[model samples]
Target chain A: HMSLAVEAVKDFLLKLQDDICEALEAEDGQATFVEDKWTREGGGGGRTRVMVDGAVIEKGGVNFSHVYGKGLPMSSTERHPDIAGCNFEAMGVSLVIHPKNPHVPTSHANVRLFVAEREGKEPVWWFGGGFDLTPYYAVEEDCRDFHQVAQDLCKPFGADVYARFKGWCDEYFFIPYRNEARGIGGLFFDDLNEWPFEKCFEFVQAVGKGYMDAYIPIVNRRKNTPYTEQQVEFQEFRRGRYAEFNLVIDRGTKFGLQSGGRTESILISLPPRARWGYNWQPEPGTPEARLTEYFLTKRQWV
Target chain B: HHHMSLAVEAVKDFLLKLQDDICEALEAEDGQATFVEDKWTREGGGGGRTRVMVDGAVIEKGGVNFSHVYGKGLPMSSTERHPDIAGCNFEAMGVSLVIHPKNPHVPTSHANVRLFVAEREGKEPVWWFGGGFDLTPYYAVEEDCRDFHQVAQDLCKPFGADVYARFKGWCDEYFFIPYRNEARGIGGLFFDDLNEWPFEKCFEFVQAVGKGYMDAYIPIVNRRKNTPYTEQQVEFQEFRRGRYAEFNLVIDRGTKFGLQSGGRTESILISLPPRARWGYNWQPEPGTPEARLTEYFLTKRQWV
Candidate 1:
């Protein structure tokens, strides 16, 4: 697109990082984020903010980066080898939050803009990212609220945007070996160059803004809910699925780590603690079983 | 390339007994845990017996599994390595095990012995054997490292003088975590693609490696089983276990083969530790034992 669009995207991503971190710190009231500003040897740099052992969040990261190089990183080059030696610029705001309490779900949101220029060819650009919810213990009201906010945000773009992206989230986050969904889904989308630059930018902003409203209320509701040691143990057990998804199944994670991106920043998405039991199955008619039977499946939540 | 010369029955019988003997020894050592067996059949062909024990007196989680699978077409993972066997009917049998001890000092260990064959109706059959064992200790003991490698060396002596050194280097290279650029642990032995000799000698070497597995590992376990460990040591164990997980999930070829070929997922993934933890950019304090684990023991060197 235009240099003006690049400037606007960078400005918005930096502010979004600040705004989200501020709100999360206010909500936590116990642990503040520690920021690391690092520059890439090849080209650009970014600020990574990580918070651990918070009043609400167990571990979390909100990172904003604008990286450029003479050629695309392997993460992109492997996907589109045709763009082997293209000049590239990529900027994104990505965050993953693992709440301390089992009642509150872990949430992730990412918004990115990528532009590549090849010699004797026109520049190509695209926007990608979405938000999703992963709950150890499910609540119908919370699922409805999260999906509803996602729907409201996408509605102005198109009538089918909510259904399409929600379905995409369900399909994308699946763990094939376990035959289970990662969690109750919210929204997922990528390759968003079909629209005008202004429309795509607005859509990305809508998703970014919608994430705070969708997640904060659920966190406030569950932060004080009474939980037992057994519940926490179950949560740790379920977090293993989270670890499996990020390490084995998540494309972004594999791509970033494989492409020599910031290992600590990218792997910050991993749970602080996780557990795996051999062939573990939830007992029948328990809340844990209900979590998978009722909430972790794809449904018309909104 | 002709009529089958390797006695399949003899090999299968030996593997079956190996599984039984290993299970009996481990169960006796645990004192309170017994293996629960599951028999599953693959959709394409063949089946396996997976025996798992968890929450034992000494062992936290361990699995010893045996399987013999035959099908019309070989998995792409294997064929990509051996294109000659791409279109032939394949038969495979193996025993694999991973033991995770409860005590942080006791260490984790893995062993596998396998034979694979490809048969085409008009051509001579192609066959090979692959097997080895390795050790991964949470705490490094020079004596234990040397003893494990000594057993491995002794097992390889009858086959060839250079076998142990070559296989040890292979183990060191194959088990490395490239992202971290750290060896998995003190190396033992790794060998594959063996068919140069007669079947009997090859079979003998396989049995020797199989029998040497417990000898290499159990002594170390007994030495450290009762040693007292602090909670910090246990936490460090879990952290190191994360590297083990990454190796299996991201790097191990056998794991990829099993998953892609529709082997039992739970049994294949049983190698994962019962508990693991990850902290952002965690580094041990200088001069601490944890630092020494990465700085000294995990380096590539001859222990024996």
Candidate 2:
């Protein structure tokens, strides 16, 4: 049964990556997925898929895996520890798309379904996935536009889905040690344990499909614009931010890195470069400052 | 030596009260800082400090701290396995002032002096005082840098120009991590093993500089408090400030010492800015204004 969910995800993302790459006209449109083996410090092992460095992608990756252990570190186990030592299994997809242009803005989406089955009549099954954008510059119109599309796709699933999910994305991607959002969010939902698997899957798919509509329009506007060296450096700095969140606050990056997923893909999710300094405060009225302010108010449409 | 420095240091009250008054002044400015009672595990002692602040105030998560933590001799090795060699075991006394200003337009500064004596009979030269002030500005204003360091220079000269010169570099070099071209701010002046100087000269310099702290910083604070900043600018600042956190956690020997010695969390974290964030694949866009700021780290832009 655990293998069934694993098979479903591996099959889905493998095909999805190829299909998306082909659609985007990406070069070397291929994905490399490895089956990760674990010592089962508790019991059982899991498989993982990691993809990297494609033509359309500056650094892109999708990971899938599962593990169950006893006495996991609380400092680390704030989330997803419900069946600790229950000997559980989970299958999920974690992805990040770092496009070559700042105009494109980076995107991340994760859909994970986990199950804890004892020798029982029915195994517990749950579904989760979220997609969000981190734009370097504030484009109010695009912000509203993106939120609108997300809201529409999510509305059919539930009235509160968009609001609830947006909050989740904000909270989930937070740097608690440092209070702030990694980016203005799109949508995120976790622990759909309350819904039927098929309905949850449908909701996840709806959210997934929502991405192209919500984000591509904005990307089209900025991606092809002639960018200056300053823009490029800022892009790299933004990527540095992506790196910090992923490496530090991100559950996926930490899990993948610790479990030894494909290093290239894992590291590739990181921007190619970054910077740091003291009293580094951005100036007012700058587009950079606007980027943060714009995140404060999000709506369904422009 | 002990009685003299105590009497001289007692005058810190005038300056300490000014710090208290400033926190009150900030209340009207949409800034709120809560004073917390922070106690450390090993110190067997802790004192409350008037911690003042503003988050997203003028900018975000900036504050000032006036704290005092005293404790008897406790071997640092007992509390931390990684305590530095030989230096780990000693009785300690601490006094410090640090501020994280909201705007990069305003500079950040910290000054602290502590005395530690060995647990042995002759408590000896462990009675050194080490502290200095540094400024960090978001945009380089050369005049500001010069004025900031000049105050530090003037404060030190009465003791000996040699003492000032030697310690100024110490401040600069001490706060830096070569890998990341960041100075903990344009440094002030710091000296340890102070028994070397005629105690009077050193104490007088400390007294003068401690009083001058307000002169060194308030103007910068007044300059930037209301300055408007765009989202992109703040994002860029957060990006660079990330490096500041990295240096403190990863390299700053004093911070490491405090944490390892079982120093109180709030006091040890006094040097920390109020808010921080991290993200995946973060890098500055080449040739962007953010990138330009990154270059400032490597360049030697002298203040005074």
Candidate 3:
């Protein structure tokens, strides 16, 4: 199924990147392709396509890869473990966009289609990726617009799906240490074969199309405006929240670091700078507060 | 017995001054003090002295006192509880101190002097004061180290030439956090049963050293308070403080001593640093100067 999906994805990537570039290129947009390739010292290898410095895109990257087999760094265990070797295929799109201005609010949305199956074992079938929004400042008008786009896309399938996953998105993207949600959210559906692969795949394509309607207009309104020093500071501090989750708390990064994942790529997901203290608090009744307010309420948009 | 002993020896003023100066030292020099003055109603009037401070200078911790009921037959425990005294009860003197400095270079220190007494319904009240001072510093400075030993020596010499040596070692053992195999700081004089001399004579020793605290510490503060530290050093300092916090919370004799004696929160906690950290698997660099200071903490050294 993974091989079949990969073959299916060849044509898929061509259309995907083309459509993405076209949508991103319209509004004084630009994009640069950063091709990175590296081989594992112990076994196989992978390539990362990191796109950056785009007009409409800001910074977006689609990393695709194929890697295989053992002698990877393994945690100590009872069994003198079988040299840890497993075949893995991950072609996922993960990106974050920092708009030019603060009022527009920074938003992050990713729709990844991936499959990982252990060799000599039945190939596992799964689809995992959802788009979420992180706004630095509150634009009630923008939040309503964003959620409405997601709801409109999900309507043909089911009304409850958007509301349920949107709530899950809000809950999942939060900093427990800070006791605050990371962002206002959108559709977050993953490994969704609860119904059928065909249905899940269809929903994926719809959401893929829905991404632009969900966020571009909001960016259009505020991205051209100049961000203030305080807003930049708030963005950096919020980036601190992103760092805390990635380094101190994220299980994926922890497992990756512990298991000899590439340090540069793994850590590259981290924002360049972050701050931690005894207790860091965001100012109340400010834009940060407005962003937080957006996370708590679940409203019907379209 | 309570009024006569304290009144006779001029201890009331000494005790009052001990409290006043420590409170003032923390406020004026350290950071701000968050004062919590709690008054408890006893059959006779009884209460506590509880001052908690954060990010403070000299006195960087919680200082507490629970001195109530100058008459006897109160709660007493028999396990190496109060090392310097024996009793069934009369006036109770409970004093405790914990100082955690903001600068990792400026080590933390603590002391508690208690006077417990026993008196039957018809018998006259009898009492004895017992306590000691101990120092715990982050980094070992020979000058600061010598000052700690000499200050206690100065106070103890007038009482008895051997007083400093006896109580100094006692402080080392008493304030020790055994799990860490470390002294709280360079040990200061710790003793009790001072009623062996005239009450005035003993109170004189307490007064001299208790007042000697700021004087004993100011020079060290002047020395290292200005020294800058790197982020790695400060983080390790925070980790070191976790050890200090563990000792106070889990095993410090004064902490246990105060708890068993019904000492008040603030007075008992006065010996704790103003701030501390606790996390797992905390270790300093293998062979750095920071690691070496840890060596000094575990053993007794006479700096003077």
Comparing to the true complex, what docking class would candidate 3 get? incorrect
lDDT of 1 at A144: 94
Which pairs of residues have clashing backbones in candidate 1?
B1-B124, B1-B125
Candidate 1 per-residue C-alpha lDDT over A26-131 given as tens digits, one digit per residue, 9 for 90 to 100: 8899999999999988779889999999999899999988888888776676678988788889899999999989998999999999999877777888999999
Off by over 4 Å in 3: A10-33, A41-62, A65-87, A113-122, A156-159, A195-198, A275-283, A293-302, B1-304
lDDT-best of 1 and 3: 1
Q: Model 3 compared with the native: what TM-score?
A: 0.48
- Let me know the TM-score candidate 2 reaches against the reference structure: 0.50
Residue-pair clashes per prediction, in order, are 2, 58, 32
**Candidate 1: Cα lDDT at B174:** 94
Q: Comparing candidate 1 with candidate 3, which one achieves the higher TM-score?
A: 1
Q: Kindly report the interface RMSD of candidate 1, rounded to 1 decimal.
A: 1.3
Instruction: Report the lDDT tens digits of candidate 3 across residue range B1-304.
Output: 5566556345555665677676666565654555345445445335555445554444444454435445334445542544333444446655556666666787666666666565545566555777776667767777777877787788777777778778777776676654345565677777766677766676677677677776676567667766777777666665566456446545555555555555443344344333333322235667878777766544646666
Best-performing candidate as measured by DockQ: 1
lDDT-based ranking: 1, 3, 2
- Candidate 1 on B1-304: residue-level lDDT in tens? 4336347768889999999999998897888899999998988898889999999989999999999988888877776778877888888999999999999989899999999888878777888899899999888898999999999999999898898989999999899977677888898888889888898899999999999998998778778888999999989999989888878876788886777766688888888889888888877778998898889999847788
Off by over 4 Å in 1: B1-6, B76-87
Best by lDDT: 1
Candidate 2 per-residue lDDT, tens place, B1-304, comes to 4664464345345336645654554443434543332332433554435353435454344344444444554545444532332543344443465565566556556766544444334543334555566676655466667777788777777676586678778877777755434565666777666666665555565566655565676666766677776777666665556556556654566765655555544455555544443333356788765555446633564655
Which consecutive 10 residues in model 2 chain B have the weakest lDDT in total? B34-43
